[PDB]
């Protein structure tokens, strides 16, 4: 067949969000609140193109907007966030429910210094709409032309010409 095209290693260099999973899980509700638009443009491009090579730049925007999400935490509320993700980080299942007062301190300092409202129960699971400028893929599966169907039956049904025509049976 053909050669599969791959992007170069410079096309894959972006500054990584090099924080732990409890750090990501601690700020995840405010992350889904504040980093909505580039994340949803990326996941729309990712379910529509069905190809990650066509989804690099939007992904870079994700990694552009996540870092600016954490810098904006690090400039303002580094200590209550640190006290919060440490308590998230203790738990083996990483329970939100074991960590409600540290969550309250982090949410208080974030609403005071950044004005961010934490999403409620049922908001980040909504199907939202995304206004992009990229065109709709007319053939995301790269499917070739389908075979033409067999001709259907038409014409009025006539009797059998002289019956069964089986050796001597005249009907």
């Amino acid at each position: 067949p053909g050669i599969v095209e791959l992007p170069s290693l410079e096309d894959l260099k972006v500054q990584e969000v090099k924080v732990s999973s409890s750090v990501l899980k601690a700020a995840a509700h405010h992350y889904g609140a504040q980093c909505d638009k580039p994340n949803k443009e990326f996941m729309l491009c990712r379910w529509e193109e069905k190809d990650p090579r066509r989804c690099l730049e939007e992904g870079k925007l994700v990694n552009q907007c996540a870092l600016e999400f954490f810098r904006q935490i690090k400039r303002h509320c580094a200590e209550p966030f640190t006290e919060y993700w440490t308590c998230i980080d203790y738990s083996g299942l990483q329970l939100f429910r074991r960590c409600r007062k540290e969550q309250a301190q982090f949410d208080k300092c974030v609403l005071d210094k950044l004005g961010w409202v934490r999403p409620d129960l049922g908001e980040l699971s909504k199907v939202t709409k995304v206004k992009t400028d990229r065109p709709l893929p007319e053939n995301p599966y790269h499917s070739r032309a389908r075979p033409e169907p067999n001709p259907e039956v038409e014409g009025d049904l006539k009797p059998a010409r002289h019956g069964s025509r089986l050796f001597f049976w005249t009907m």
């Binding site: 019956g163 069964s164 089986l166 049976w169």
Partner: protein
């Protein structure tokens, strides 16, 4: 056996055949065969004697081995196709294993070695069920996979079944073994025309079921399981000898009887496809089963026999046995050849 439980078990036999007939998923095909086997095992053990336990154990082992080979065929189909539709198979190894497994369920040669034994060990009504109703489901699966059936395998199994069913019944005095070798020969006749025209396969299946049902119903009506007890029928009921006469002449394929209808059409559908030698030697072998039928009705049905004095007691009592559908089945098993183009309703 409790008649309610008997009704439930017969409905489960019918339900398993229906699940094999209607289902689109191979697992449900396998489930229908499992249900059919599990339900038919008490019908064979109705009288509770050691011959029925031997017959049911042999039937269990053959149908269980066939069911495991069927599931292995389905599983190789899943390897090489990633799906489960009951349609053509996507590997010749699955094709061979499923043809072998259905040949074991039908009793075709070289897996014929249970059909004369099991039919001998079980009563006449359960042998009727075995030789008629238990043929419907594997012929349905063979009807749906015929784009994948290897021609050389199905013709080897078919002509081997026809030769072994021909040369196995020459030696037989037991009526149930005569019907069982006749079963093996007729399944060869059904499966040899399968890849050419499956409508004639269905025609042979229905005419065979009618003639076999007629023969077992006459056997239950006379309570005769051997040739010699069949010879003692004319002094009790003379019409029953006439009916076993005309129905055994029909099962071998005499014109102008109805059992000449399928196989003639089968020859008629094998010379279209430029096969001349194969239906020729196939009907040469059918002449041998017709020939021992003509010995088994000339020597031992027509010319009247020495009787016993206790038969003169049995003159004073009529048959109270429910001969269900017996005149209809006897007319249909003999006098249906002028309606030979009825076969188009099976298309």
């Amino acid at each position: 056996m409790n008649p309610i439980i008997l009704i439930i078990i017969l409905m489960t036999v019918m339900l398993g055949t229906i699940i094999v007939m209607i289902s689109t998923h191979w697992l449900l095909i396998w489930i229908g065969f499992e249900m059919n086997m599990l339900a038919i095992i008490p019908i064979m053990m109705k009288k509770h004697n050691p011959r029925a336990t031997e017959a049911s154990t042999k039937y269990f082992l053959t149908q269980s081995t066939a069911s495991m080979l069927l599931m292995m065929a389905i599983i190789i189909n899943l390897m090489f196709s990633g799906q489960w539709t009951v349609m053509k198979l996507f590997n010749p190894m699955a094709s061979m294993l499923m043809t072998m497994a259905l040949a074991m369920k039908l009793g075709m040669a070289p897996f014929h070695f249970w059909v004369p034994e099991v039919t001998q060990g079980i009563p006449l009504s359960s042998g009727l069920i075995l030789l008629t109703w238990q043929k419907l489901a594997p012929m349905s699966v063979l009807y749906q996979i015929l784009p994948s059936i290897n021609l050389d395998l199905i013709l080897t199994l078919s002509i081997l079944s026809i030769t072994i069913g021909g040369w196995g019944g020459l030696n037989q005095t037991q009526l149930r073994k005569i019907m069982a070798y006749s079963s093996i020969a007729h399944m060869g006749w059904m499966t040899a025309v399968l890849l050419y025209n499956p409508t004639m396969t269905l025609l042979n299946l229905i005419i065979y079921i009618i003639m076999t049902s007629t023969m077992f119903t006459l056997f239950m009506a006379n309570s005769t399981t051997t040739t010699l007890s069949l010879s003692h029928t004319w002094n009790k009921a003379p019409i029953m000898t006439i009916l076993v006469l005309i129905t055994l002449l029909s099962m071998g394929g005499l014109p102008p009887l109805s059992g000449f209808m399928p196989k003639w059409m089968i020859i008629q559908e094998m010379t279209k496809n430029d096969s001349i030698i194969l239906p020729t030697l196939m009907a040469i072998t059918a002449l041998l089963n017709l020939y021992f039928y003509m010995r088994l009705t000339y020597s031992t049905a027509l010319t009247m026999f020495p009787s016993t004095n206790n038969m003169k007691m049995k003159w004073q009592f009529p048959t109270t046995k429910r001969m269900t559908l017996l005149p209809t089945m006897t007319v249909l098993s003999t006098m249906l050849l002028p309606l030979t183009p009825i076969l188009s309703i099976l298309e």
